[PDB]
Amino acid sequence: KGIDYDKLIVRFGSSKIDKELINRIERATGQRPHHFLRRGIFFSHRDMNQVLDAYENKKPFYLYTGRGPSSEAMHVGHLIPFIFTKWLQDVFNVPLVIQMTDDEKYLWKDLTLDQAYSYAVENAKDIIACGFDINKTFIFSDLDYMGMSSGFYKNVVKIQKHVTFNQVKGIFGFTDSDCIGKISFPAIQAAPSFSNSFPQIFRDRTDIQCLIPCAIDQDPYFRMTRDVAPRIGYPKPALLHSTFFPALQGAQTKMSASDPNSSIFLTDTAKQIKTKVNKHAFSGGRDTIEEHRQFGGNCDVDVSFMYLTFFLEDDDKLEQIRKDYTSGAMLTGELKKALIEVLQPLIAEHQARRKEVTDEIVKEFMTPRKLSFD
Amino acid sequence: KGIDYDKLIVRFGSSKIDKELINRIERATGQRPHHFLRRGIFFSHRDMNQVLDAYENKKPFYLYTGRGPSSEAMHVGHLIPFIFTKWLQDVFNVPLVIQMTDDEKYLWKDLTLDQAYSYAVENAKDIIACGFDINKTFIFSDLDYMGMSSGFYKNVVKIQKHVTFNQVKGIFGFTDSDCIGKISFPAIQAAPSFSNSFPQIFRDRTDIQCLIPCAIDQDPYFRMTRDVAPRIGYPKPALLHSTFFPALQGAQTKMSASDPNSSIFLTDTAKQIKTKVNKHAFSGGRDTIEEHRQFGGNCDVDVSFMYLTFFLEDDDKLEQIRKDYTSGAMLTGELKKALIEVLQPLIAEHQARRKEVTDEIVKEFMTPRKLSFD
Numbered sequence: 051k052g053i054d055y056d057k058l059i060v061r062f063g064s065s066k067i068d069k070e071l072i073n074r075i076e077r078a079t080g081q082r083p084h085h086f087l088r089r090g091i092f093f094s095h096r097d098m099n100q101v102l103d104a105y106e107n108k109k110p111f112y113l114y115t116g117r118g119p120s121s122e123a124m125h126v127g128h129l130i131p132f133i134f135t136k137w138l139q140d141v142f143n144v145p146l147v148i149q150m151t152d153d154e155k156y157l158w159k160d161l162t163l164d165q166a167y168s169y170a171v172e173n174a175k176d177i178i179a180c181g182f183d184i185n186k187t188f189i190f191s192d193l194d195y196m197g198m199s200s201g202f203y204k205n206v207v208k209i210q211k212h213v214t215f216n217q218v219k220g221i222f223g224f225t226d227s228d229c230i231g232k233i234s235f236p237a238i239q240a241a242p243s244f245s246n247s248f249p250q251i252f253r254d255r256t257d258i259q260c261l262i263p264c265a266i267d268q269d270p271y272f273r274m275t276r277d278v279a280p281r282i283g284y285p286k287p288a289l290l291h292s293t294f295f296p297a298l299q300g301a302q303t304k305m306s307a308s309d310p311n312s313s314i315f316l317t318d319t320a321k322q323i324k325t326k327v328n329k330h331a332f333s334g335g336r337d338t339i340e341e342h343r344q345f346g347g348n349c350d351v352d353v354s355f356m357y358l359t360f361f362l363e364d365d366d367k368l369e370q371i372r373k374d375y376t377s378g379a380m381l382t383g384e385l386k387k388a389l390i391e392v393l394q395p396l397i398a399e400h401q402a403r404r405k406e407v408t409d410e411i412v413k414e415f416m417t418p419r420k421l422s423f424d
Numbered sequence: 425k426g427i428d429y430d431k432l433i434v435r436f437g438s439s440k441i442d443k444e445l446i447n448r449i450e451r452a453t454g455q456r457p458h459h460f461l462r463r464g465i466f467f468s469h470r471d472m473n474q475v476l477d478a479y480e481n482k483k484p485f486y487l488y489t490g491r492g493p494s495s496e497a498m499h500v501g502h503l504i505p506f507i508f509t510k511w512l513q514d515v516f517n518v519p520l521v522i523q524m525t526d527d528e529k530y531l532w533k534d535l536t537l538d539q540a541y542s543y544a545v546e547n548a549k550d551i552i553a554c555g556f557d558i559n560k561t562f563i564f565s566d567l568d569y570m571g572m573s574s575g576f577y578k579n580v581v582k583i584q585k586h587v588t589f590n591q592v593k594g595i596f597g598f599t600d601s602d603c604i605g606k607i608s609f610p611a612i613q614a615a616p617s618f619s620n621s622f623p624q625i626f627r628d629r630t631d632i633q634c635l636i637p638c639a640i641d642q643d644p645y646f647r648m649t650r651d652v653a654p655r656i657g658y659p660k661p662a663l664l665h666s667t668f669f670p671a672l673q674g675a676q677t678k679m680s681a682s683d684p685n686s687s688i689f690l691t692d693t694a695k696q697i698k699t700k701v702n703k704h705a706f707s708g709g710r711d712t713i714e715e716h717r718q719f720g721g722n723c724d725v726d727v728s729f730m731y732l733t734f735f736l737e738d739d740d741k742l743e744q745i746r747k748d749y750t751s752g753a754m755l756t757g758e759l760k761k762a763l764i765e766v767l768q769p770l771i772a773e774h775q776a777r778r779k780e781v782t783d784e785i786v787k788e789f790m791t792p793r794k795l796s797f798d
Contacts, residue, residue, distance in 0.1 A: 157585050163578065196570065196577040203570040203577070204537065210605030211531050215589075218604060230592060231584030234608035 053301070053350075055093060055266070055293055062269045064094045064291060071098060078102050084137045086292065089359050089368075092134060094266060094291035096276070101259050101288045105142060110424035111259035112252075113138055114242050114287070116149030117177065119169030122307050123315035124176050126393070127295035130360065132180050134263045134292070139186055145251060145421050146187040149242050150174060153192040157231040167193050174412050176316060179404040185422045188251065189415045192238055198418060201249040202241060209237040212278040221274060240275040243287040250418040256284055266291035295360065296353050298330040316401070320394045327354060327390050328383075335375070335382035346378035347385070354382070354389045361392050427675070427724075429467060429640070429667055436643045438468045438665060445472060452476050458511045460666065463733050463742075466508060468640060468665035470650070475633050475662045479516060484798035485633035486626075487512055488616050488661070490523030491551065493543030496681050497689035498550050500767070501669035504734065506554050508637045508666070513560055519625060519795050520561040523616050524548060527566040531605040541567050548786050550690060553778040559796045562625065563789045566612055572792060575623040576615060583611040586652040595648060614649040617661040624792040630658055640665035669734065670727050672704040690775070694768045701728060701764050702757075709749070709756035720752035721759070728756070728763045735766050 059066055067090075072083045075098075086092045104111050115135050117128070139146050150170035156163050170191040177189060196203055215233060218224055224233050241247050245258035252258055262272065272289060279286040297305030298312050305312045311330045314323055334352030336342040349355045349372050362368050371388060374380035433440055441464075446457045449472075460466045478485050489509050491502070513520050524544035530537050544565040551563060570577055589607060592598055598607050615621050619632035626632055636646065646663060653660040671679030672686050679686045685704045688697055708726030710716040723729045723746050736742050745762060748754035 153581050156581060163582055193578060193581070194574075197573045197575070199571045200568075201571070204567060207527050207530060207567070207605055208537055210608070211603040213604050214601060215598075215604055215607055216600045219600065224589075226590045226593065227588060229585040230587050230589055230608040230611060231581055233589055234584070234604040237604060 055090070058266060059094050062094075062266070064096055064266075064269060064289070067093050067095055067098070067290075071095070074099070074102055078105055079141045081141050084134065084141075085363055085365065086130075086134050086137075086360075088365060090293070091130070091360065092263065092290050092292045094269075094289070096269075096272075096289040097286060098261070098288055098290060101261050104259050105424065108424055109257075109259075110144065111142075111261060111288075112145040112147060112245065112423075113261050113263070114147045114149070115263060116151055116239070116242075117173055119150055119152050119155050119166055119173045120307070121169060123317045124173065125307070125313040125315045126357075126361075126397070127297075127304070127313065128176075128316075129180070130292055130295050131263055131265075132177060134290070136181050138261070138263065139182065142424075144186070144423050146182065147242055147248060148174075148177060148187065148189040149239075150189060150191045151239070153196075153231075153238065154235055156193075157229065157235060163193070167191060170194075171412060171416075174415065175404055175407045176400075178407045178412065178415060179316075179400050181403075184411075184415060187415065188248065188418065188421065189412075190418065191416065194416065195418065199247065199249065202247045205241040205244050205247045206237045208282045209240050209275075209278055210234060212281050213237060213274060217274060221270065236274060239271075240278070243275055243279075244284045248418070251421050259285055260287040261290065262287050263290040263292065266293065296332075296356050298326060298332060298353055300332045301351060301353060301356070314393060314397065316397055316404075318397060320398065323393050323397060324390050327386050327393070331357070331386065331389070333382045335385075339381065342381060343378040347375040347380070347382060349376055352382070352385065354385050357389050358385075358392065361396060362388075429464070432640060433468050436468075436640070438470055438640075438643060438663070441467050441469055441472070441664075445469070448473070448476055452479055453515045455515050458508065458515075459737055459739065460504075460508050460511075460734075462739060464667070465504070465734065466637065466664050466666045468643075468663070470643075470646075470663040471660060472635070472662055472664060475635050478633050479798065482798055483631075483633075484518065485516075485635060485662075486519040486521060486619065486797075487635050487637070488521045488523070489637060490525055490613070490616075491547055493524055493526050493529050493540055493547045494681070495543060497691045498547065499681070499687040499689045500731075500735075500771070501671075501678070501687065502550075502690075503554070504666055504669050505637055505639075506551060508664070510555050512635070512637065513556065516798075518560070518797050520556065521616055521622060522548075522551060522561065522563040523613075524563060524565045525613070527570075527605075527612065528609055530567075531603065531609060537567070541565060544568075545786060545790075548789065549778055549781045550774075552781045552786065552789060553690075553774050555777075558785075558789060561789065562622065562792065562795065563786075564792065565790065568790065569792065573621065573623065576621045579615040579618050579621045580611045582656045583614050583649075583652055584608060586655050587611060587648060591648060595644065610648060613645075614652070617649055617653075618658045622792070625795050633659055634661040635664065636661050637664040637666065640667065670706075670730050672700060672706060672727055674706045675725060675727060675730070688767060688771065690771055690778075692771060694772065697767050697771060698764050701760050701767070705731070705760065705763070707756045709759075713755065716755060717752040721749040721754070721756060723750055726756070726759065728759050731763050732759075732766065735770060736762075 072087050076083050101111050152166040152170035156166035174189050243260045245252045246256045276286045294304050297303050332353040335347035446461050450457050475485050526540040526544035530540035548563050617634045619626045620630045650660045668678050671677050706727040709721035
């Protein structure tokens with residue numbers, strides 16, 4: 051029952067997203083708001099109006115997200131952010147910068163420097179699969195970009211001294227036993243938030259607003275970055291907070307990346323997707339059919355219904371489902387089939403595109419070059 | 425009386441330089457050993473034979489030294505290393521890599537990132553003045569090179585995780601109040617010690633020996649670098665330890681970089697050089713002329729005589745001076761005049777060359793490019 055997201059906004063001191071804001075965004079774009087905005091999926095921001103101010107006056111801004119490279123599969127939750135960011139991008143016709151923290155993984159996990167980089171490239175393919183207009187998005191490897199940016203490291207250093215060790219010990223719990231690469235990394239994570247880190251596309255000029263869509267329990271991490279922003283004469287990056295995408299087995303967790311099952315993977319096949327949802331997707335319906343008819347299912351805790359909230363685009367069909375499962379008219383198996391019919395095409399479509407992404411294609415995304423926007 | 429350099433070799437576990445080694449170096453080069461080697465100025469090494477092995481078999485090696493950029497003047501002591509390294513370079517016809525730690529200064533001192541860089545460029549002019557064959561030496565700014573080396577940062581990261589925070593807390597005494605840029609810097613200092621950090625001149629290949637001439641109280645700093653060397657499949661860099669160049673006012677200190685006087689600066693004029701030596705260069709002679717004749721001067725503590733040890737190239741003239749000052753035949757004013765006649769031309773010659781170094785000249789030294797050697 052510890053789901054409260056409004057009591058969450060309060061303690062972090064961020065701002066709730068209201069109708070005002072969504073309409074302002076829809077007017078600014080001439081488009082219909084994303085369902086993530088309609089349903090309270092992405093409910094908080096930090097300076098989103100500032101971002102809109104800029105856009106309305108024809109003053110550009112850019113978006114920045116990252117991914118911690120890995121070997122395991124890569125699931126559906128990993129898409130919430132990438133999906134919202136693809137919308138925002140297309141909707142505003144704006145530049146997207148994507149950080150592949152191979153160095154972080156190399157520092158934290160047990161990889162070979164050449165390994166972590168490997169993942170950064172492969173994981174890049176999964177990210178391209180989501181569409182992302184090539185003439186608008188730049189995907190970089192920390193390990194690769196550092197040594198080919200006349201502005202990235204410069205910004206790391208500026209951030210590196212304005213952040214004490216104590217500041218990170220109380221935010222990532224670093225210990226005297228941790229390597230020096232770890233203690234100093236939070237700066238690498240922060241740097242892309244400032245426009246001149248990418249001269250190849252903005253040239254000098256630090257007047258460009260950055261927008262970072264991310265999870266809400268990731269806010270106390272961008273505090274640091276936002277605090278040391280004007281302290282170094284740079285604009286604070288705008289945030290857009292999203293809720294937690296639950297793990298099949300329950301909503302108590304957000305679970306893993308291992309524990310096979312527990313997460314629909316982008317590599318799972320139609321059969322596999324079907325199995326995981328029917329067998330593991332936690333059910334909020336009753337145990338017997340008669341008890342389910344009498345009392346109905348509980349939509350709040352049902353994982354299969356939650357997933358629908360994310361991937362079912364029709365607002366009306368979702369409300370029908372919500373209503374009938376609650377009354378008992380619809381049974382969890384029916385809910386499951388609904389979800390399965392939305393996930394199979396989605397995941398399979400991803401598989402299709404991920405096949406169309408060559409090497410001469412990734413090379414181009416990773417090649418720092420010029421782009422298109424306002 | 426705390427001068428003991430042999431009791432110093434013992435506690436650090438390094439190796440004394442003997443005749444064997446000097447002859448091996450003189451045979452390897454077909455040249456007469458430098459006076460720094462003849463007089464026990466540079467008396468310790470770590471793997472210098474390995475370096476010679478390589479050179480004899482026609483297998484190249486390279487040299488690496490650095491300088492912490494600054495605004496003040498830049499004195500004669502700052503030359504011991506640069507002088508020895510110019511010899512070694514010319515004598516072996518080998519590549520020299522020079523680190524301008526502007527980022528370090530920006531982190532530690534109170535500069536503007538753009539300031540520290542300024543110094544790196546100016547201080548570069550002083551370093552070029554010493555000769556250094558352009559087609560053999562590469563001078564880089566940490567701030568500039570980082571963002572234009574497909575191998576430098578890669579090596580920083582490799583070093584960054586093999587060195588804990590505790591390892592540096594007990595070597596540079598870092599505290600939880602120090603910024604994260606500081607804690608992680610020792611890696612930036614170490615990286616140039618490995619050949620593939622500079623692909624523009626060695627391309628891949630990490631089989632190239634690095635030699636680092638430096639002070640002997642700087643050994644417990646290169647321990648770290650040498651320890652994490654094979655731990656990452658890289659050759660340990662060779663050292664060549666030198667003694668302390670004393671400060672005019674006494675040998676108790678090595679004194680400063682401020683306290684005007686106390687150090688002959690490369691900007692000092694002939695008049696100024698003459699004044700500082702006569703007025704401040706600590707004297708080991710007696711107070712009265714009669715007492716000086718009877719007991720003689722003490723060469724061990726006389727700073728003016730010590731300076732001669734460094735800059736007077738003739739071994740015979742130096743022994744004459746040593747003998748006569750000790751017996752009392754020569755008076756401290758005569759010793760002073762001797763030193764002054766060696767320093768005025770040396771420092772003035774530097775001034776002359778430092779004027780001949782243009783901007784299209786520094787640009788070329790700083791431009792990572794190809795060089796010449798074995």
